[PDB]
Amino acid sequence: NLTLNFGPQHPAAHGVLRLVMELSGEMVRKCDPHIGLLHRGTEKLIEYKTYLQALPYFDRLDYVSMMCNEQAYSLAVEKLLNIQPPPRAQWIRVLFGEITRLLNHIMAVTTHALDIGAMTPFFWMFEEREKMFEFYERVSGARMHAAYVRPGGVHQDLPLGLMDDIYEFSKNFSLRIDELEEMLTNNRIWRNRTVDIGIVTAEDALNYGFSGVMLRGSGIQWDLRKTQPYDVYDQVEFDVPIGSRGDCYDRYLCRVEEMRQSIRIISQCLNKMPPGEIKVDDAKVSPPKRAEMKTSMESLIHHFKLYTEGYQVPPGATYTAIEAPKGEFGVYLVSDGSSRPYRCKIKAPGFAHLAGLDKMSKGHMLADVVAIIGTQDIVFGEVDR
Amino acid sequence: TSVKPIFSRDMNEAKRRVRELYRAWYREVPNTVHLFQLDISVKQGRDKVREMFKKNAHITDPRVVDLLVIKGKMELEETIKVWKQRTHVMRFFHETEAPRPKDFLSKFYVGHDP
Amino acid sequence: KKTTGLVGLAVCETPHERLKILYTKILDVLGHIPKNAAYRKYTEQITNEKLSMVKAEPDVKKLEERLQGGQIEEVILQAENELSLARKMIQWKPWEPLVEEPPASQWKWPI
Amino acid sequence: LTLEGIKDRVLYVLKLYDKIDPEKLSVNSHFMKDLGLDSLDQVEIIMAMEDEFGFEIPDIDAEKLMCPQEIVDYIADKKD
Amino acid sequence: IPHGKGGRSSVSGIVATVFGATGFLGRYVVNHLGRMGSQVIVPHRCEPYDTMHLRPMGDLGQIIFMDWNGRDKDSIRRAVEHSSVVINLVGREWETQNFDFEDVFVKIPQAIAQVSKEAGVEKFIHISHLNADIKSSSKYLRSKAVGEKEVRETFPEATIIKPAEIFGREDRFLNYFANIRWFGGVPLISLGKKTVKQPVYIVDVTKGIINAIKDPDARGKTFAFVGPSRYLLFDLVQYVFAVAHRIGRLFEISPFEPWTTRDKVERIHTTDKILPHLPGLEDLGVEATPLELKAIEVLRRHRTYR
Amino acid sequence: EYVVAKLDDLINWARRSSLWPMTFGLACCAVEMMHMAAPRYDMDRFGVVFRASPRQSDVMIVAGTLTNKMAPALRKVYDQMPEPRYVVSMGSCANGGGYYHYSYSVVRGCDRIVPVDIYVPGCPPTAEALLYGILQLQKKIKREKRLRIWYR
Amino acid sequence: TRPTVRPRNDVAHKQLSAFGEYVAEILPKYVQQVQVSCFNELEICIHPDGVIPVLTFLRDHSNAQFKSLADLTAVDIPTRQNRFEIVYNLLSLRFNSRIRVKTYTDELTPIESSVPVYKAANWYEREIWDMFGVFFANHPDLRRILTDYGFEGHPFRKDFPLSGYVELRYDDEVKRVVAEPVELAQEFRKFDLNSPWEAFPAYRQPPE
Ligand SMILES: NC(=O)c1ccc[n+]([C@@H]2O[C@H](COP(=O)([O-])OP(=O)(O)OC[C@H]3O[C@@H](n4cnc5c(N)ncnc54)[C@H](OP(=O)(O)O)[C@@H]3O)[C@@H](O)[C@H]2O)c1
């Protein structure tokens, strides 16, 4: 049998993920991919840093999420430190935490529609995506990778503006999602390109430990978005999509309705924000203000020491996970009792979502296999967990 | 020792296993030398095979040798197939590395006793 | 209905007696275990709790209430594996006492 | 089919190796109690019958021969 | 003064200067000099792109590039004013359409036998050839021995190195063979009389320099390079077609980089196994390389497997 | 000569007028180059076409972070390029390997393997200084082919 | 006490004190310590004889579904006289409850793996072999994932230093990309950060 390794080929998509194919003439029936192109030494590296200093290495763990990562870290730290965050701060973590889902669910369709080979829905949506990075630069520090969420809540307040901008932005977005509905849904060939492909629906679709979509849209109703709270996140109203059967085209149609939920939540979140503060007030965790660290005596000693070493975290293990826009996000943060943490093991999606490519692939073509991968939305560097 | 072994029991399921895969390496050294398209003599490969087995012969305890069996067998998984693209097999030979002195008068002129 | 909600199963076929065999299928195997472990004390407790509400009342939809599983065909699977669970309780012996106590200082966290 | 046929084949295996044995092609070279070798090099002696005359060596009998008589004897019942 | 391991990013004391260093010989020598770590100062002539493949041998800050002609003086003086040792290997084959080609082996080794020597350098080493004799052969082979004596007036102690013919990867002499896909493969010249010379291997060449660069006491005592075992035969030309189974030129092509039906064809068929009283390679040890093992590497033709 | 040296103001102009780059998407510096492909700072048709087969390349781009499991595969593709090539690496993890720099399995530099010509700094260079690096590269081509064989 | 302090609750602290209690009651063969976290988490310390059946007991029930294997991790702890610590984390689907399984071991002593019990441990279980050398029993395919092909270190333990020994470089000596002993341009300056005076009263050690 021919043993071609169609992978390292820089054939668009993402020139990585080099695997083997022991194809039985035309059908595959055996797929054993290799990973480890970026191992980077991540989990060993954090063992020498402090809590505030290690924080951007959670940010660079995806390619896409900037505020959904570091959402799974501060909320994994504030439980250890007996802190609730202040109420103005929680309305921003839901706002940017429900704006990164309008970055994955744009990239999760176009990049899938580029491996397939369509050109024009790649350029028709990233030109609208530019209207959104101006937000990131205006609020935090940079284009994408922002050390913005801290353990002491939000870093700083978003400036004057950004409320007649987001309302200006979000009132003209549903026309753009009505474009791709005409581009892909009512079309037949793309429907014929993906129906009854990847029919994985049994209880081994959950014994493989999958997280969401490539879950509930295939069947079993469950999510971490209204059975487990984060912040002020249950006080808004929305629904969660479910597809019919257990193929890719009934996990594709989650993502059209999923983007039709984030517009509602943003248009529901803006009406409910109170004026208030930014940081936690007790200042053993938050740094004091700049106009304060130049006047009093108490401000500097709880400033100058708070950057030489970090916080004082109590011992005892902990664990949590939140909704990453492609899955769960496990962090088993072992604390020791000093400024420097102990072991920090992460669970990212793709461990389950790509080990189950063995079950999902066989009985099918070779041209099916590239169409499988862009449905799970697998990003490397994120499989470094 | 209140601990169960891996494969062997005491030294005799062990020492027949290190002899076992030695033949699998021994027919492999002429097999790969024309496959990976590298150019040395084939007897150098057979010398380096027995180089590796003889050095660790100072063990008088089971399940450590058996732990090296799992290490020794996993080497053949990449080896019989093509998973080491012309570099990892060349990594066995410290070829372009400068020679260590290993002599007392020679160490004394260069180095702060490394 | 023709689709059972949870995709991957099929309504196959009859409620109220496919269950009623499988509870009683367990209870006869339940008597085989020597009774010193409290495994019998709670498992026979909930099956008699279940089968009393199972046998035998209309409708299918009423049997969903007061029996907290998924749909009724999936409630089979709630106890399907449990039959495979209790028969292996004879094979290994959990009713035996503790074995291999740890060496007296191990589960202390701060080093 | 000749029982002398496997006598010639065995008794130029050992000196075809350029190692230890100094033309001692005798039938009593008793392999590390008389002849003197390495524990690994016994296994390399067994190796040259897969290609010369053809032979399997399936089992623990390679750990049993220990003299070139028994090498012929284990090919004796193999052949005739 | 030295420090620590000389694996990479060390100091090792020495500061050399290698001219030429764009051909087959001068590149491969420096690729050892950036391994032990030093201030290698390599000035190139007229080629910014042709040194691009050179840089990933010295780590960081160890190499440096400058421009020089050679018929000018200070460009050969401004660079060499801070160093310790200096070697030279400059030269080539056939006369240029613009140059003079005689004094390039006379005044150009003299142009760095200038104030360069007076500035305070030591262990200055030039290259020779085993066959460069004062006899009336050839136009290129002789007029190399003229530089061996007329420039030997300057630098009274040098240890000028004398190599034999070399074989490596991308030389000219061994690649003169098997680049002869033609309507006839003729040897030189249909005779097995003098073939061959001493093909020393290229690792032995670069190893002889680095032992001599702090030997010590190797100035004036000039050295010769032993070849393989032992003379060589006519079989070499048959050895080519048996196992082979029968850089700043221009934008399209160079008009004249020929096979040169001139005194090129005789500069190699003039063997001259010279005097064995030179020490010259085994004493500058250790160099011992056959031919039969390194021949698989350089030859490359259409079969590639069998 | 005025006649011959007039010619390389076409040829050394023509190579800096049509560059067909390869991109190695490995890490977060890949994503920002896609926004350069997105038609705000429209990368196409300013001299340079989009993606292309690995054979027909002139300017290779290494972006992101290199691991030791990718150090053989980089050199093999680097051999297959034709001769007038150039290497330009964006991203601060291709200049010393950013941080991750003290890790046990990251290639230190992306310079100890391939010879690279233009160094753009930054975790993601914002697709704003990167067109500036490309116009630096066409500014670097002031070289000559004549008066090289015409001199020596 | 005030705002900006996490409001704890007692309902989940009650049932998780209730549920996990009769778990040790019905298998007093493998369970050696159970503890309740002060923020609604549970640990069931298990000697690894019962590595398979206790999972197999939590594999199925009618009062405990627990069929969502989320997290297999591995934590080393030196100065314990049995170093390593395999820790699971599993999820009840129907009940919204988290519980972890802490099973210690040592290096050479193997562990009966969870291959028939769960099929999400296909790539997780191999990872501990590549990073520590903990040879799990009877796995159908043990291989090398997330490391390079020539390592001998199992790096995620503590004796492996920050850099390796294997700083890689290229030369044009023939073609090869050759290994070399490791050489840095900078020390990785290691600080000293542990302030004295014991900020924590509750976790005070036995004073000996
Ligand atoms: N050991 C042997 O067997 C052997 C055989 C044949 C020749 N040689 C001679 O020994 C040395 C080996 O050279 P090679 O094998 O590496 O080939 P090569 O290409 O001739 O390298 C020698 C360098 O000298 C440079 N050069 C030529 N003329 C120059 C000039 N007027 N000014 C400045 N540089 C000049 C050349 O080109 P650039 O100008 O671009 O730098 C070249 O880079 C040469 O001197 C050669 O004549 C030795």
Ligand code: SF4
């Ligand atoms: S640090 Fe720079 S190169 Fe590395 S992933 Fe982030 S943006 Fe890319």
